[PDB]
Amino acid sequence: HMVVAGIDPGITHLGLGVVAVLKARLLHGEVVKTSPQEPAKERVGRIHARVLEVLHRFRPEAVAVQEQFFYRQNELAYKVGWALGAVLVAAFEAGVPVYAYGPMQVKQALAAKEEVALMVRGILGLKEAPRPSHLADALAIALTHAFYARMGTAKPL
Amino acid sequence: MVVAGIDPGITHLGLGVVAVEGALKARLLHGEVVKTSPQEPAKERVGRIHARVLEVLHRFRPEAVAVQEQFFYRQNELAYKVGWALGAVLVAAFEAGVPVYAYGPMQVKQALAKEEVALMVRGILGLKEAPRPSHLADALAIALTHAFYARMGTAKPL
DNA sequence: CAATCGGCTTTGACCTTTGGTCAATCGGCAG
DNA sequence: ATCTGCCGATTCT
DNA sequence: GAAAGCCGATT
Structure with a gap:
């Protein structure tokens, strides 16, 4: 009934997952690797092109992205900002509202990093935990949004 | 020689374009600041932001885009939102097939010389007055800095 | 080629028999 | 409507 | 008082 995209941003790897909804099905998962x-x-x-293509193909009602709290080197924050920018243009172009969630929101909603993954595997009924790590985390974010969305406490911006 | 200069920000984004003759001298083709809230x-x-930039690139067809580098960032979150802004630019720069270059402040100040740099920008472009507001002025300086390095063959891509 | 991995996490000016302090940076809300 | 000006600066253990 | 990530190196 409900379709949600999850994203774990980064310039080198970017996790991108989509789920249909507590129990859901994995519709799509990939990681974008740039040098x-x-x-x-x-x-x-x-990055922008892949995201745009994906949004177009699956028509989600929401996009969820990973919030982040510390950033040892300001430069790192910046390049991640670059990545979210491509996403946002993409999200803008598709007319899809965007939501962002922090790690503790994810961990509490669903559960240790190893502990969270086990719950994601379970909700989606997979034989094994998803790989690699950045895709797995993206999917967690998608699922976290669904959970908050189910209780009516969405978290935009 | 046509060069675009950019001063990134989420609230105000400076966007300027210059056409270089060196004997370094150039004409102001376009200047604006994008305000969002x-x-x-x-x-x-x-x-x-992406739309305006893309429209501008399309209309003026520059050979290069120059953006301001930055060194400190007291609150990591600031850096992030500026990162957002550069991302829109990059998609735009990507779509237009225009190579992108980034320069730091000292590179700008040395190449051209804050109040002292502006005076030199006003001069090179032959304007009656220094350009306003500050974010546009800066963007133009970046464009002009690139041209200078480009003229000596020391481009600085991203 | 995948995946895996370990290091480095801002900077420069000018000053201060020596490594010190120092400022820079921008976004939200208020006139 | 537009510039102009100030203040903060990472949580949760 | 620690949380992540990106790079450039491996294998």
Whole structure:
């Protein structure tokens, strides 16, 4: 009945998952891998294109992204900001509202990192925990949103 | 030689374009500042940013885009939202097939010389007065800094 | 080529027989 | 409507 | 008083 996209942002790996809804089915999962040897604009451009393509194909009602709290080197925050920007243009273009959730919100909603993954595997009925780590986390975010959405406490912006 | 300069921000984004003759001298082709607000949905702020930039790139067809680098960021969250802004730009820069270059403040100040730098920008472009507001002025300086490095063959991509 | 891995987490100016302090940075809300 | 100006600066263990 | 991640190196 309900379709939710989850995202774990980063410039090198970006986790991208989609679920249909507490029990849900895995509709899609991928990780976008871009290189430092790649021109900045090519890196982010590919990101935007893949996300846009995905949003178009599956038409989710919501996108959920991982919030983050500390950032040892300000520069790192910036490049992650770049990644969320591509997403946002994509989210904007698709007319899909965007929501963001912190790690404790995820952990509490669903559960240790190893402990959370076990619950994601279970809700989606998979033989094994999803890989790699960035995809798994993206899916957790999607599922966290669904949970809050189910109780009417969405968290936009 | 056509060069775009950009001063990134989520609230105010400076956007300027110059055409270089060196004997370094250039003409102002375009200048604007994109204003968005926190009362606006995140996706609408950034989306408008991407659209304006993409429209501008399309109209003026520059050979390069230059953006301001930054060094400190007291609150990591600030860096993030600026990251958002650069992302919209990059999609735009990607879509237009325009290479992107980034420069730090000292590179700008040395190449051209805050009040002292502005005076030099005013001069090179032959304007009656220094450009306003501050975010547009800065964007233009970045464009002009790139041209300078480009002229000596020391481009600085992203 | 996948995946895995371990390190590094801001900076420069000018000053202070020496490594010190120092400021820089921008977004939300108020006139 | 527009510039102009100030203040904060990472949680949860 | 720690939380993540990206890079550039491996294998």
